Amino acid sequence: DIVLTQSPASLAVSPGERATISCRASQSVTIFSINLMQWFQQKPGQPPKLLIYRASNLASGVPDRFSGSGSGTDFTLTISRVEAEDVAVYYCQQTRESPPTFGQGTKLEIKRTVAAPSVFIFPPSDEQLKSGTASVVCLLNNFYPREAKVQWKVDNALQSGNSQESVTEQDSKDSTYSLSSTLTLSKADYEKHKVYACEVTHQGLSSPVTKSFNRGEC
């Protein structure tokens, strides 16, 4: 089977600037003077979309900023002027031999200015507490870069082992990330304590931001 090896594995490009992604093949993908190399884009949460076929032919409805080059074993996808909507994993594919094979993908990130998170806290619903479980949620919204530290404090005691974080992929419009930290406690442990606090540390923040609530009031 032909193996396709892409480079780079990941890259970060400022809007307006050029992205260059290469794809190497173990064997020639050329037959009848045709280079059977395709390029695909998989945006966050979406199926793959054909961008280019036969090395250099743009698919319908693909912007002209996407261009394919190369022959034989060496191929290149160039995005001339990157847009925020281009955040995706890009994949090479060979159809010269069966089975068709794909590269392992190249992750394109969009470089933007530092943006501090907007922080929000959500107490557990009374409906959920009746079931015996309390989920406390803290939201970090519209921030860059991805690195952030979220610490939970219950009655001023830092928590460990009882929190899970989830992060969105970069937004297609503003190139930011958002993050959820969910603290999960038994109903009893939740009712044993009063002050629930989310402390956030990020490059965009000169000092940590704390969002807090007292169990019982709003």
């Binding site: 199926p47 907007s118 929000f120 939201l139 958002s178």
Partner: protein
């Protein structure tokens, strides 16, 4: 069966069906390609003109691709399934139209190979308050908890509210059940005038839950 995710018990046979429009078109063929979770893409096989088929030798033991001209449908059947067959399956329609080759990958169907039973979600509000406000902006949302298997899709106001929506990737919990939250930022002025409803779709359990989120 396309864009209808669900469960297929280990050792059983996965049967997926796709509705195709273009048996009439030139160059027409359907490829079946899968993407395991967190992974890349794997080509399984194709069915062409006249029901001629080609298969990847990794699955030739257990893979049959068929077509039904009566119902404009193409099907995949994968026998003796294991957890390694857990993946998004794509029915890829391809051919020539206008002056260009095209591929339509569809929506994809997440198939989870599990002996565990389906469970619909418990939906709880992430209610707006003074602690969910920033400069005239309020955050609100829905916590979608204890569902199996993936996936859950979340809309707001039946698709009318799209700006400011962030649906987080699901987390597998200790319990073997999944949880996610979908949030939206809105004007704090709208909290008393606009209704906010999360529409949560769990096709594996045949369940759809609408939750109105009200201010505190």
């Amino acid at each position: 069966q396309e864009s209808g995710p669900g469960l297929v018990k280990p050792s059983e046979t996965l049967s997926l069906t796709c509705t195709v429009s273009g048996f009439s078109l030139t160059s027409y063929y359907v490829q079946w390609i899968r993407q395991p979770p967190g992974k890349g893409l794997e080509w399984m096989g194709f069915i062409r003109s006249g029901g001629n088929t080609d298969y990847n030798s990794e699955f030739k033991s257990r893979l049959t691709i068929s077509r039904d001209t009566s119902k404009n449908q193409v099907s995949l059947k994968l026998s003796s399934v294991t957890a390694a067959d857990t993946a998004v399956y794509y029915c890829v329609r391809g051919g020539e139209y206008n002056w260009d080759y095209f591929e339509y990958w569809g929506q994809g169907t997440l198939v989870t190979v599990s002996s565990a039973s389906t469970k619909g979600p418990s939906v709880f509000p992430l209610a707006p308050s003074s602690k969910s406000t920033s400069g005239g902006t309020a955050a609100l949302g829905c916590l979608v908890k204890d569902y199996f298997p993936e996936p859950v899709t979340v809309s707001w106001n039946s698709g009318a509210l799209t700006s400011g929506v962030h649906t987080f990737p699901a987390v597998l919990q200790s319990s073997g059940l999944y949880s996610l939250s979908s949030v939206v930022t809105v004007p704090s002025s709208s909290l008393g005038t606009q209704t906010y409803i999360c529409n949560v779709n769990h096709k594996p359990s045949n369940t759809k839950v609408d939750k109105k989120v009200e201010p505190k």
